[PDB]
Amino acid sequence: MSRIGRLPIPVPKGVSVEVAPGRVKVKGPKGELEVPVSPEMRVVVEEGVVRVERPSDERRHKSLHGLTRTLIANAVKGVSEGYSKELLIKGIGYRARLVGRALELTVGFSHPVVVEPPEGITFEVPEPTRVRVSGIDKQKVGQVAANIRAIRKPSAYHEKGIYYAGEPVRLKPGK
Amino acid sequence: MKVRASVKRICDKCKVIRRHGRVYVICENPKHKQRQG
Amino acid sequence: XXXXXXXXXXXXXXXXXXXXXXXXXXXXXXXXXXXXXXXXXXXXXXXXXXXXXXXXXXXXXXXXXXXXXXXXXXXXXXXXXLXXXXXXXXXXXXXXXXXXXXXXXXXXXXXXXXXXXXXXXXXXXXXXXX
Amino acid sequence: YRLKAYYREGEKPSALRRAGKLPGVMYNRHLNRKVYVDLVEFDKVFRQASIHHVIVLELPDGQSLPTLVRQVNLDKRRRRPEHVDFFVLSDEPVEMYVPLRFVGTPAGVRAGGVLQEIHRDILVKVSPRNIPEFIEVDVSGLEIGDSLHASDLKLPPGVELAVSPEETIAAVVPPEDV
Amino acid sequence: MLMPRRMKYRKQQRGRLKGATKGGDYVAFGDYGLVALEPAWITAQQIEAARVAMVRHFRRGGKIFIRIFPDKPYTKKPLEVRMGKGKGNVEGYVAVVKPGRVMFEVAGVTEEQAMEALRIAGHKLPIKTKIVRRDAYDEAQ
RNA sequence: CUGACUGGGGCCUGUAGAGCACUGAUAGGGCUAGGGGGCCCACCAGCCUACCAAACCCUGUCAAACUCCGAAGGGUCCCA
RNA sequence: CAAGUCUGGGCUAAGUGGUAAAGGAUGUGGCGCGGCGAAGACAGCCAGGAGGUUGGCUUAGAAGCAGCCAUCCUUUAAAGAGUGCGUAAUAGCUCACUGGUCGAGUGGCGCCGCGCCGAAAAUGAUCGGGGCUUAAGCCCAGCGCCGAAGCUGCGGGUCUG
RNA sequence: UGGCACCUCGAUGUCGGCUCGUCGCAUCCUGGGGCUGAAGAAGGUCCCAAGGGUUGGGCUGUUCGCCCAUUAAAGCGGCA
Ligand SMILES: [Mg+2]
Ligand SMILES: [Mg+2]
Ligand SMILES: [Mg+2]
Ligand SMILES: [Mg+2]
Ligand SMILES: [Mg+2]
Ligand SMILES: [Mg+2]
Ligand SMILES: [Mg+2]
Ligand SMILES: [Mg+2]
Ligand SMILES: [Mg+2]
Ligand SMILES: [Mg+2]
Ligand SMILES: [Mg+2]
Ligand SMILES: [Mg+2]
Ligand SMILES: [Mg+2]
Ligand SMILES: [Mg+2]
Ligand SMILES: [Mg+2]
Ligand SMILES: [Mg+2]
Ligand SMILES: [Mg+2]
Ligand SMILES: [Mg+2]
Ligand SMILES: [Mg+2]
Ligand SMILES: [Mg+2]
Ligand SMILES: [Mg+2]
Ligand SMILES: [Mg+2]
Ligand SMILES: [Zn+2]
């Protein structure tokens, strides 16, 4: 047993954490984020670490302790560019060229899919066989990466899909 | 499988998740996932 | 200490003057032969110093309360657990470090091994004639 | 063994048996004294402490009563004891039912039966000094057709034998083929 | 199925289902027992369906024990027949059971296999039937 | 002043419950009148039956048309 | 719609209350047992995860893994004639068993109260309705109040003695 | 299809068809999705979804049912 929040934060390149009496605003060298906090549970803003403290033991104080700490723990490494989040593509003739930020890509359709990115999402394309989605917040990267998953569904008896790391456990062939 | 009234754990690596009120049971292979309904 | 007493007495009775209290597997250079390189000194000085070990701070606290404390090595870092008894000890130590550190990846001998009612050293254990 | 006792003076006790205090009564020749014992102590000792063992009963007068069980009334759609009749043993060869058991290969283990007729080893009376804890019955080769017990080789060590009958004893049954 | 070969009279009544057990709570034959909890009837089809589900489940060892016997004729009139005009025909003999009575008793079957086998035969019956093991709750003195 | 009802005394029953000693059915176990029979033998001079099975004894049961048992109650009579 | 948003202790997150069963499920709250544990416990991340041994015609094939015998031993600081895959069988992936830098609690149960699914019919839906979540539901209590043509307060008539 | 006999014997018109609709989903298609013994198409099954459609004919008084040509489909029921 170790409830998440019984071990401290401490962060080199010590970004600023303020009060914001119902929420948490985190400002770093790259960007600022936002974490909503339940008002009954008290996170405190001491030197170096960001403490977390729960009143009692029921089904909300025992889970919001750990929710509230861990959503800060994403924002600790989030504002210092600690997320790479590759998306490697398979395919016989598939690629993904970038014009500006709207990433069009050939996934076997009759038209290249134009991906419109939201604010604060960088489509770093080093290769035609693999791209990577960068940004600041982990939710903002994982949601857009799920939108990249929303075009092509992998593991359909063969290749031409995405796996977020590369994991073919697809299924047996059909001959 | 699919929607059943009784839910049992075939091939012991099942995980039983109660989401949105009702009970799902999931694995790696999706031919053994179950919804109670 | 509830079920493990006779098992701790199999390494806390004859261990009055231990030998190879070095490092066990530690990923790089770990047996990978299961005949001579695994038991190391069984190709020369038989099996009288091939550990028996279920402790590093468990029954080692009993060995640190029995006689002296033999030696002091891994207690904060990662180097698993390795014990011995005597057998060769001062004799075939370079052969035991040659079969235990004769290949692997480089030379994974033993960090701080004891030697006859005292203690051993890192340089004297890895690059030692005794 | 080593169970506490109390007193009863003609109470309610259907209302007293709600918190795990079932009533009881003990006797050897006279003094039919009404007691009540605790259910997790009597149940916990009564897990393994069977009829053969002399369960001794501390009493607030300072006596240790060498008792045993006469009957456990099942609650019969609740599976619980209502009232347990204790029996003090005195200077008398009292009656005992000892759960003896069987050890060995039953009928040549692959061609083996069930050997289910335990039936609590019908009766052995005994003095309070020669009372046993365990008597052993082997099942050395007893295959399907012949080699039954029939209580002829039912000479226990000492005191006593079965008094009147020699008829109820275990046997070998065929298995359930498909 | 099975049926009693001789009777004093062919048809008989129904009665009620009250009373606790009237005997049949201690096991005294096997190491386990399937004990009932609700008052109902046990048809010979329910006897056969639960008896086949043992010998088809576990094989080569373990004698099955039944302590139920149907002596009550279930009387049912033919279809599309008006009321009166006597009782109906006899189709299958049923067995009255009380709550807390042990019906099925396995023999020579271990723990993890007898819990499973009594669990399979428990669903063949319309009664909440829990499973009891061999305890010290005999009627010995 | 006898009445409905109630209190103190008797009498009666065979229901609930319980039980197998009676009338029947019964899950097993032991014994085995005997029988397809017999390993097969100058037939009785056997042997185990994993073949069947009468009757008997135990562990266990069920019953409106079974009761060795048996209330709570009801009826009747005497007094208040 | 006349009278407590009464005083206490818990419980329910389903509108259960306010529609019913067999069965199922880390839904919660309470009681008892057992193992483990700061001679460092569970899920974790790394580890030589093994030698007789492809034990034996097993009918092609039996390497732990379709199904058989009578079920082993020894090397070890922990390992079977093997937990699930994957192979026609192979090989291989994970292991039951265990060594640590960590960390103070951790699993199987047997009851018990309220719950969830099971629960789809024909004009417009609802527990009487609106609404109700430390309650305006459910369990144990307590002090009051509302509440009939019932009883008493008073007046009047009739019938019987 | 039944059982019951509760309003209806000073009577509540019975089968079928034409016209006219309306509602439920336990969906025939169209719209999504999971599994598959799903290589693709065509499939099987299950979950949500009743918004719209559900043909023109021969046979018999027929509801139903059997055949011709199509469609993606010629759904099951209630509303005396
Ligand atoms: Mg009088
Ligand atoms: Mg009178
Ligand atoms: Mg009277
Ligand atoms: Mg009678
Ligand atoms: Mg009766
Ligand atoms: Mg009387
Ligand atoms: Mg008011
Ligand atoms: Mg309900
Ligand atoms: Mg309250
Ligand atoms: Mg009045
Ligand atoms: Mg008046
Ligand atoms: Mg009708
Ligand atoms: Mg009538
Ligand atoms: Mg009229
Ligand atoms: Mg008419
Ligand atoms: Mg008419
Ligand atoms: Mg539907
Ligand atoms: Mg359907
Ligand atoms: Mg579709
Ligand atoms: Mg397809
Ligand atoms: Mg519509
Ligand atoms: Mg429509
Ligand atoms: Zn699984």
UniProtKB/Swiss-Prot annotation, chain A:
Gene3D superfamilies: Ribosomal protein L6, alpha-beta domain. Pfam families: Ribosomal_L6. GO terms for biological process: cytoplasmic translation. InterPro entries: Ribosomal_uL6-like (IPR000702), Ribosomal_uL6-like_a/b-dom_sf (IPR036789), Ribosomal_uL6_a/b-dom (IPR020040), Ribosomal_uL6_bac-type (IPR019906). One of its GO terms (molecular function) is structural constituent of ribosome. Keywords: Ribonucleoprotein, Ribosomal protein, RNA-binding, rRNA-binding. SUPFAM superfamilies: Ribosomal protein L6. GO terms for cellular component: cytosolic large ribosomal subunit. This protein binds to the 23S rRNA, and is important in its secondary structure. It is located near the subunit interface in the base of the L7/L12 stalk, and near the tRNA binding site of the peptidyltransferase center. Belongs to the universal ribosomal protein uL6 family. Part of the 50S ribosomal subunit. This is Large ribosomal subunit protein uL6. It comes from Thermus thermophilus (strain ATCC 27634 / DSM 579 / HB8).
From Swiss-Prot, chain B:
InterPro entries: Ribosomal_bL36 (IPR000473), Ribosomal_bL36_sp (IPR035977). GO terms for molecular function: metal ion binding; structural constituent of ribosome. It holds the Pfam family Ribosomal_L36. Binds 1 zinc ion per subunit. Zn(2+) binds at residues 11, 14, 27, 32. Its cofactor is Zn(2+). Keywords: Metal-binding, Ribonucleoprotein, Ribosomal protein, Zinc. One of its GO terms (cellular component) is cytoplasm. One of its GO terms (biological process) is translation. It comes from the Bacteria. SUPFAM superfamilies: Ribosomal protein L36. NCBIfam families: rpmJ_bact. Part of the 50S ribosomal subunit. Belongs to the bacterial ribosomal protein bL36 family. PANTHER family: 50S RIBOSOMAL PROTEIN L36, CHLOROPLASTIC, LARGE RIBOSOMAL SUBUNIT PROTEIN BL36C. This is Large ribosomal subunit protein bL36.
UniProtKB/Swiss-Prot annotation, chain D:
InterPro entries: Rbsml_bL25/Gln-tRNA_synth_N, Ribosomal_bL25/Gln-tRNA_synth, Ribosomal_bL25_b-dom, Ribosomal_bL25_C, Ribosomal_bL25_long, Ribosomal_L25_dom, Ribosomal_uL5_bac-type. CDD domains: Ribosomal_L25_TL5_CTC. Keywords: Ribonucleoprotein, Ribosomal protein, RNA-binding, rRNA-binding. One of its GO terms (biological process) is translation. One of its GO terms (cellular component) is cytosolic large ribosomal subunit. Signal peptide: none annotated. It holds the Pfam family Ribosomal_L25p. GO terms for molecular function: 5S rRNA binding; structural constituent of ribosome. The keyword Nucleus does not apply. It comes from the Bacteria. The keyword DNA repair does not apply. This is one of 3 proteins that mediate the attachment of the 5S rRNA onto the large ribosomal subunit. Belongs to the bacterial ribosomal protein bL25 family. CTC subfamily. Part of the 50S ribosomal subunit. Contacts the 5S rRNA; has been isolated in a complex with 5S rRNA and uL5, 5S rRNA and DNA binding protein II; 5S rRNA and uL18; 5S rRNA, uL5 and DNA binding protein II. This is Large ribosomal subunit protein bL25. It comes from Thermus thermophilus (strain ATCC 27634 / DSM 579 / HB8). The gene is rplY.
UniProtKB/Swiss-Prot annotation, chain E:
One of its GO terms (biological process) is translation. GO terms for molecular function: rRNA binding; structural constituent of ribosome; tRNA binding. The keyword RNA-binding applies. Keywords: Ribonucleoprotein, Ribosomal protein, RNA-binding, rRNA-binding, tRNA-binding. It holds the Pfam family Ribosomal_L16. SUPFAM superfamilies: Ribosomal protein L16p/L10e (SSF54686). Transmembrane segments: none annotated. InterPro entries: Ribosomal_uL16 (IPR047873), Ribosomal_uL16_bact-type (IPR000114), Ribosomal_uL16_dom (IPR016180), Ribosomal_uL16_sf (IPR036920). GO terms for cellular component: cytosolic large ribosomal subunit. NCBIfam families: rplP_bact. Belongs to the universal ribosomal protein uL16 family. Part of the 50S ribosomal subunit. This protein binds directly to 23S rRNA. Interacts with the A site tRNA. This is Large ribosomal subunit protein uL16. The gene is rplP.
